[PDB]
């Protein structure tokens, strides 16, 4: 709320007046104008409310009102004008500040040091900027001056009502404290239960994610059902607590709709008693009630605007710190430049980042780049080459060394404004702008001409000094003068989005020409020939080293292939061989290629639709008890709210008759009390069963989705649009939308129609003539002159919206503007912004102000016309008074209330749309379903364990081009061991999946001379047991992860089977031994324990067939040895058939059969040899002898 943000802002002085300190004086007193022109509109209602009683007294007594009407329209006109002025006066100021913030932010971005640009890269900033620039725009516009109006109205109403009789108003307004009290008492009991409801939802989230990730360790142990119990038990507490919340959330509504209809009654009952004891007519009573009651409605609409303005404050203060960040490499324009360029000299340069403050890079970087010669660099990927490039340019700084140039000038005194003036950087990819081919090349001199008028502002016209003659010969030099003539519009042709039309080679030629036109001196080439041959490169280099100024210049190349560096003057090759880098090899090619047989020797040696929703409605129309109650409550509310109008009316007419005034008050206040008591119960029992119906639809759709996603097959999960992230996003969000949207917006339509029928009926009956006119007016107002609709439609368009293009092509081509060209854009966005401000802005703002003044001065004219027409028809004898008074207030009150509750709807369309996205998922057939019971029944006794394969041809459907298996055929023995070896990464872990029916077939698999597809696969998966490479443990206790699948097992069995695994020493060394709740995915344990837990999990089932895989691949020291002990312990017992995947010769030689795989040609694997078993260790040529001597 506001009471917390106010305390937060008080104790550091975040100013209330912060956005209003970047403004001229021609914008500092339009604010004052718009201020005083919004207090004068805070006196309209204290006048209408003051005459609203006198009109009624003057109509039902036999006199005229025309002098009062003419005193009531002029104020409407001046309200219209004074409301038309302020919108115009404010939107200009909004545009001004919204411009200045941007035009400082772009600047403060363009002076960063490069240390930042790696931290805050590009597209984030423009994705942030706009966000802030729609928090300050939509909170300082017209809805900042709708606060003094309402406060003025409050003050006027209250003080006027108090000066008249200061004992009635106090006793009317002493009921409202009991509203704030109830609010603060109920918010507590809402939050206390809502936080626990949130607590018991993340558990379900974690269950769903952790069970959809590891689906194949769930179907292999047949554990579909022992997750559904956790899901359906952690879903009920959520329901009961959130319904406890909704109950209190609905009771408040009824109580607040009730106490007002007691304030009215007590006010009238005390009013009729101050009259008699005194006799102050009966006209200064009808107005006090409306005054005191409408005084507090203002306090229910002021608060959101203050929250939005505080939001704008904290948004701006999140932006005036970026602008005032120190770049620490600033351009002070005080560097004493050099006459010429010579002798770059490193001296022991060491560098560390700001984040990784101790991950050192360099050790002994020290050399000198003499003038006049060439150089080169060849090394590893990132051992410190690119930083040297970025340090010649001086983006970063030396931390310990110094780069004193020409033995007379330090780098931190050389002008950065001048140093970049003589450096040409040909990067890997060309950075070409998207205007033309001539302007890209003419973007070189826009920085050097500016270094001529400063020392002598003239930035506009001097750029014409760039003649179009140098382009000709500099194009001739780079061998591009031919193709430029081949296409029409030679220099005027325009390239597409970042040069996406022509060939890459020619674009890089243009980039090279851009580099060369300025007569660069330190020419830093970097991976220029990643696509082309070395012909153009060598010709260009011949042009460079023969260019005027070759006597003292320093060219640098950083490339990979050694052919470009066939000739050189010095070649620095470096290597960090970890904690520091240094140079390993120096000297020319002649004195290095033969002298040492080092790394460079190796390098030169090597390279040189309607149904879907009637489902929902059929579900909703089955709760025959909780449906009728809502119907009766709707009828009661809609039928007994309008009656208050024509009870108020009857009460007015019996107040201007001193006779029989006591009895009438006694009879008409009690009825109001009863109406309030009924309205309380009606609203309470209406707004509670809405949510009670909403919950059950959710928690009977979620159950179906999840319970029909688990039992699907594996091809479902191997597709691209079937991902856990997208499936865990439906279940919560869109089902919550089915709760809110549909079965909130049905009730609103029902209640609205029930009001609108009865009101129009029993208002057209008393006085037919007035209702036709009033309906005509409201129809032609709300459906033809719809003001707010046109006001939001004409606003979202310009909110969506060439300055929206220059910005995008600058944060992508940032590197070049840092190299050269800065204020050609800092003073180009202003122009293309201002040329599009005025021409559209003036029309839009002079229209959208007239479309806001008429919205604040429309009901007044309607009411005035209504009372005039009523007083006109009466003085010719057509109609009486009571009929008019009963036919008008119905429209008034019913329209207000209907407009109130109608603004509670939710997203009804997207919820009817997403339902059609996920409806096929709760109905999709699986076709490999474990719930079936078809096939031959099998007992565990008669299993001999003889796996057999005859022929296999497998290909993943996700990528049907890479066949992996061709004609696999072998046999495994019964109660024996059978190892496997072959080419590493040959897809050996697919045999297993085919054996457990994750993929059907072409090929054949057998078991005891019977096919696999005739077994009733519930039992088929109930005897195998795999030990995957990486295990997976759930977020339950350690006692339960072992009982996964098998619910019936005591605790001593766990101790027994843990004794085998050699894990009952760590568990019996810690409190909460067999109740130690591990974390998600078992991330609270060590790898040497997780796999032993898995092995204990696989040995409890008494598996008749075992399937291992490299039990000790990458484990620690002790648990490795313990695991090998377990493996060699189990394998000694000739009880169960075992199929290992081993590559350790100590275990191979014990095996009874060995099978070799190979992939000669990349189309399929097959069996090279069958049953070597170490007796065929060397009998013919084979790979078994290789893999047993290679390992």
């Amino acid at each position: 709320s506001t009471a917390e943000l106010f305390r937060k802002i008080k104790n550091e002085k975040i100013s209330f007046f912060l956005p209003f300190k970047c403004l001229p004086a021609q914008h500092r007193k339009l604010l004052f104008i718009s201020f005083v022109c919004a207090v004068l509109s805070g006196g309209t209602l204290p006048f209408f409310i003051s005459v609203f009683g006198v009109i009624l007294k003057n109509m039902n007594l036999g006199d005229d009102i025309n002098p009062i009407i003419l005193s009531l329209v002029s104020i409407g006109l001046v309200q219209f004008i004074l409301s038309m002025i302020s919108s115009y006066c404010m939107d200009v100021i909004t545009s001004k500040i919204l411009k200045t913030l941007k035009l400082e932010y772009l600047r403060s971005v363009f002076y960063q040091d490069g240390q930042f640009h790696d931290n805050n890269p590009g597209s984030k900033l423009r994705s942030d900027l706009d966000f802030y620039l729609e928090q300050v725009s939509s909170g300082i516009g017209t809805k900042f001056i709708t606060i003094f109006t309402y406060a003025s109205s409050f003050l006027g109403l209250y003080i006027w009502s108090l000066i008249k009789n200061a004992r009635l108003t106090l006793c009317i307004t002493c009921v409202f404290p009991l509203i704030y009290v109830c609010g603060v008492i109920c918010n507590k009991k809402v939050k206390l239960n809502k936080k626990t409801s949130l607590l018991y939802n993340n558990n379900t989230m974690s269950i769903i994610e952790e069970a959809l990730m590891g689906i194949r360790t769930v179907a292999s142990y047949c554990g579909e059902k022992t997750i559904l119990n956790k899901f359906n038990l952690s879903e009920t507490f959520y329901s009961k607590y959130i319904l406890k919340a909704n109950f209190v959330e609905a009771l408040h509504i009824g109580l607040i709709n009730g106490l007002i209809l007691v304030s009215y009654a007590f006010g009238f009952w005390y009013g009729t008693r101050i009259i008699i004891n005194s006799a102050f007519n009966g006209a200064s009573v009808i107005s006090i009630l409306l005054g005191v009651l409408i005084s507090m409605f203002m306090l229910t609409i002021i608060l959101p605007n203050i929250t939005e303005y505080m939001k704008a404050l904290e948004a701006t203060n999140s932006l005036y710190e970026i602008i005032n960040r120190k770049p620490l490499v600033e351009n002070n324009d005080d560097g004493e430049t050099l006459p010429n360029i010579k002798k770059i000299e490193f001296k022991n340069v060491r560098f560390h980042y700001d984040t990784r403050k101790d991950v050192e890079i360099y050790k002994d970087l020290s050399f000198t780049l003499k003038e006049g010669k060439t150089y080169a660099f060849v090394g590893e990927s990132g051992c410190g080459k690119s930083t040297i490039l970025k340090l010649i340019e001086r983006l970063y700084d030396p931390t310990e060394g110094d780069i004193i140039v020409n033995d007379s000038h330090n780098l931190k005194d050389i002008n950065l404004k001048w140093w970049r003036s003589k450096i040409g950087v040909v990067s890997q990819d060309p950075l070409l702008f998207s205007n033309s081919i001539k302007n890209n090349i003419k973007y070189s001199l826009y920085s050097l001409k500016d270094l001529e008028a400063m020392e002598n502002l003239e930035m506009k016209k001097e750029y014409q000094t760039i003649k179009d003659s140098d382009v000709v010969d500099v194009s001739k030099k780079v061998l591009i003068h031919d193709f430029v003539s081949s296409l029409p519009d030679k220099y005027d042709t325009l390239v597409g989005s970042n040069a996406s039309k022509l060939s890459g080679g020619q674009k890089q030629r243009i980039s090279i020409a851009r580099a060369i036109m300025r007569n660069p001196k330190i020419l830093i080439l970097d991976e220029a020939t990643s696509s082309l041959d070395n012909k153009s490169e060598y010709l260009v280099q011949k042009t460079i080293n023969n260019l005027k100024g070759n006597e003292n210049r320093i060219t640098i190349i950083i490339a990979h292939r050694l052919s470009t560096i066939r000739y050189a003057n010095t070649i620095f090759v470096l290597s960090n061989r970890n904690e520091g880098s240094y140079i390993i090899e120096q000297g020319t090619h002649d004195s290095l290629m033969k002298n040492k047989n080092g790394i460079y020797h190796l390098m030169i040696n090597n390279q040189k639709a309607p149904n879907n929703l009637r489902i929902i409605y059929k579900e909703i129309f089955s709760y025959k008890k909780d449906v009728t109650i809502i119907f009766f409550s709707i009828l009661v509310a809609g039928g007994l709210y309008p009656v208050f109008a024509l009870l108020y009316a009857r009460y007015v007419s019996t107040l201007f008759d001193f006779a029989n005034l006591e009895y009438n008050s006694n009879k008409y206040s009690i009825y109001i009390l009863l109406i309030a008591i009924a309205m309380f119960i009606s609203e309470t029992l209406k707004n509670y069963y809405n949510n009670k119906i909403g919950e059950k639809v959710e928690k009977t759709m979620k159950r179906r989705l999840f319970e029909n996603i688990l039992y699907q097959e594996m091809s479902f999960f191997d597709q691209d649009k079937n991902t856990p992230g997208v499936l865990s996003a439906h279940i919560n969000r869109d089902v919550h939308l089915l709760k809110t949207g549909l079965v909130n917006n049905i009730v609103i339509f029902s209640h609205f129609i029930m009001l609108f029928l009865v009101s129009m009926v029993m208002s057209f009956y008393f006085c037919p003539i007035v209702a036709a006119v009033l309906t005509f007016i409201y129809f032609i107002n709300m459906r033809v002159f719809a003001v707010r609709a046109r006001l939001t439609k004409s606003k979202e368009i310009e909110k969506k919206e060439d300055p929206s293009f220059l910005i995008q092509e600058a944060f992508y081509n940032m590197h070049t503007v840092i190299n050269y060209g800065l204020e050609d854009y800092f003073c180009n966005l202003i122009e293309k912004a201002i040329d599009y401000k005025n021409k559209g802005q003036k029309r839009r703002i002079i229209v959208n102000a007239a479309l806001w003044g008429f919205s604040q001065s429309a009901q007044l004219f309607i009411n005035s016309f209504a009372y005039w027409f009523g007083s006109f028809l009466i003085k010719r004898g057509t109609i009486l008074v009571d009929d008019f008074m009963k036919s008008l207030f119905t429209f008034i009150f019913t329209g207000s209330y209907a407009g109130k509750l109608m603004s509670l709807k939710g997203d009804s369309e997207n919820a009817k749309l997403s339902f059609e996205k996920y409806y096929p998922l709760m109905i999709r057939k699986s076709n490999i379903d474990v719930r079936d019971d078809g096939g031959i029944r099998i007992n565990k006794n008669l299993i001999k364990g003889k796996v057999d394969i005859k022929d296999v041809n497998f290909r993943y459907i996700s990528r049907p081009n890479v066949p992996i298996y061709k004609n696999l055929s072998f046999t495994c023995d019964s109660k024996k061991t059978t190892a496997i070896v072959g080419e590493t990464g040959s897809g050996k872990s697919t045999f297993m999946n085919l054996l457990l029916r994750f993929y059907d077939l072409n090929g054949e698999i057998l078991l005891d001379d019977i096919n696999i597809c005739d077994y009733n696969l519930r039992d088929l998966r109930n005897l195998f047991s795999i030990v995957s490479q990486e295990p997976m443990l759930f977020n339950m206790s350690i006692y339960e992860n072992i009982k996964f699948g098998r619910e019936d097992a005591t605790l001593e069995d766990v101790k027994r089977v843990s004794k085998f695994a050699a894990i009952d020493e760590f568990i019996e060394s810690l409190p909460n031994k067999y109740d130690t709740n591990v974390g998600p995915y078992g991330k609270s344990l060590s790898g040497g324990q997780k796999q032993r837990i898995a092995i204990a999990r696989a040995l409890l089932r008494e598996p008749k067939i075992l399937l291992l895989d490299e039990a000790t691949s990458s484990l620690d020291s002790n648990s490795e040895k313990l695991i090998e002990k377990t493996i060699v312990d189990i394998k000694d017992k000739a009880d169960k058939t075992i199929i290992t995947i081993a590559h350790r010769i100590a275990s191979i030689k014990r095996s009874d059969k060995i099978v070799v795989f190979n992939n000669p040609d990349r189309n399929g694997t097959f069996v090279q040899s069958h049953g070597t078993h170490d007796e065929l260790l060397s009998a013919q040529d084979g790979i078994y002898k290789k893999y047993v001597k290679l390992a």
Side-chain angles (χ1 to χ4, degrees), residues 373-390:
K373 293 182 181 180
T374 63
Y375 294 97
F377 290 101
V378 176
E380 295 82 2
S381 296
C383 290
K385 289 185 265 71
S386 178
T387 295
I388 295 164
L389 189 151
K390 290 188 284 185

Side-chain angles (χ1 to χ4, degrees), residues 210 213-218 220-221 1026-1035 1041-1042 1044 1063 1078-1098 1107-1115 1123:
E210 191 175 5
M213 188 64 71
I215 195 67
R216 63 186 68 193
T217 189
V218 170
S220 62
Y221 294 104
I1026 56 171
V1027 176
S1028 178
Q1029 185 177 2
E1030 63 277 17
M1032 185 174 176
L1033 300 177
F1034 294 105
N1035 199 359
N1041 282 322
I1042 295 166
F1044 186 78
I1063 195 165
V1078 305
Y1081 295 101
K1083 293 182 180 180
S1084 67
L1085 293 173
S1086 65
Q1089 296 177 357
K1090 189 184 286 186
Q1091 188 171 1
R1092 286 182 288 172
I1093 294 163
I1095 293 165
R1097 188 176 68 191
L1107 299 174
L1108 297 171
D1109 190 0
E1110 291 180 353
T1112 60
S1113 297
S1114 178
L1115 297 175
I1123 290 161

Side-chain angles (χ1 to χ4, degrees), residues 354-371:
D354 194 1
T355 62
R356 294 180 180 178
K357 294 181 175 66
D358 290 329
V359 175
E360 184 63 27
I361 299 163
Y362 292 104
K363 185 176 180 180
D364 292 330
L365 184 64
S366 66
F367 64 93
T368 303
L369 296 172
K370 288 176 72 175
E371 54 81 17

Side-chain angles (χ1 to χ4, degrees), residues 447-464:
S447 179
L448 292 171
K449 299 292 186 183
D450 293 330
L451 297 176
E452 295 177 353
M454 184 181 72
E455 291 80 1
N456 190 0
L457 295 174
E458 298 180 353
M459 293 187 288
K460 288 174 72 175
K461 276 74 70 177
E462 67 186 1
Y463 296 168
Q464 185 64 42

Side-chain angles (χ1 to χ4, degrees), residues 433-537:
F433 295 105
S434 168
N435 60 4
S436 66
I437 291 166
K438 65 182 179 68
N439 290 320
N440 282 320
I441 295 166
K442 290 187 285 184
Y443 284 170
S444 294
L445 276 294
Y446 290 166
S447 179
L448 292 171
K449 299 292 186 183
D450 293 330
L451 297 176
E452 295 177 353
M454 184 181 72
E455 291 80 1
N456 190 0
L457 295 174
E458 298 180 353
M459 293 187 288
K460 288 174 72 175
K461 276 74 70 177
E462 67 186 1
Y463 296 168
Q464 185 64 42
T465 303
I466 296 164
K467 62 179 74 174
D468 197 359
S469 179
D470 291 331
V471 173
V472 176
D473 62 358
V474 75
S475 174
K476 290 181 184 293
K477 289 182 180 180
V478 299
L479 284 71
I480 198 66
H481 183 76
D482 192 359
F483 182 78
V484 68
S485 298
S486 178
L487 73 164
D489 292 331
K490 292 175 69 172
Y491 295 169
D492 294 331
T493 184
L494 64 88
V495 302
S497 66
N498 193 359
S500 66
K501 264 62 181 298
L502 295 170
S503 179
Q506 292 174 354
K507 291 187 287 187
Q508 291 180 356
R509 288 179 184 176
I510 295 297
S511 179
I512 294 162
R514 177 173 61 181
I516 294 166
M517 179 173 174
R518 66 191 297 170
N519 288 318
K521 189 61 66 68
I522 296 167
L523 184 63
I524 293 166
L525 298 174
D526 188 359
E527 295 179 353
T529 61
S530 66
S531 66
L532 292 173
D533 60 355
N534 290 319
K535 181 174 73 67
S536 178
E537 189 273 330

